[PDB]
């Protein structure tokens, strides 16, 4: 009876979470460089 039921499969990959992890890491590293240089975000604008 699985041929008339069970819904439709989905080839889904959780790449969005990976992308968000990369974006968060980029923000963290940019903030870290700003802190090391002593040139804060409020200090650049």
């Amino acid at each position: 009876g699985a041929l008339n039921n069970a819904g439709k499969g989905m080839i889904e990959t959780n790449i969005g979470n990976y992308i968000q992890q990369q974006i968060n890491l980029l923000e963290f590293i940019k903030m870290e460089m700003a802190d090391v240089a002593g040139i804060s975000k409020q200090r650049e604008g």
Binding site: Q42, R43, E44, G45
Partner: protein, 42 residues
């Protein structure tokens, strides 16, 4: 915005230097043009 203006004030500074030199150039050009029998300068 001032601290952001600092980021492009280097462009503006070199632009000002170029403008100054261009105006000295135009001044010497006008000085040479003076002695060419043009009645506009009168």
């Amino acid at each position: 915005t001032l601290q952001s203006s600092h980021i492009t004030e280097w462009l503006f500074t070199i632009h000002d230097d170029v403008k100054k030199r261009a105006l000295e150039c135009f001044l010497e050009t006008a000085k040479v043009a003076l002695k060419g029998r043009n009645k506009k300068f009168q």
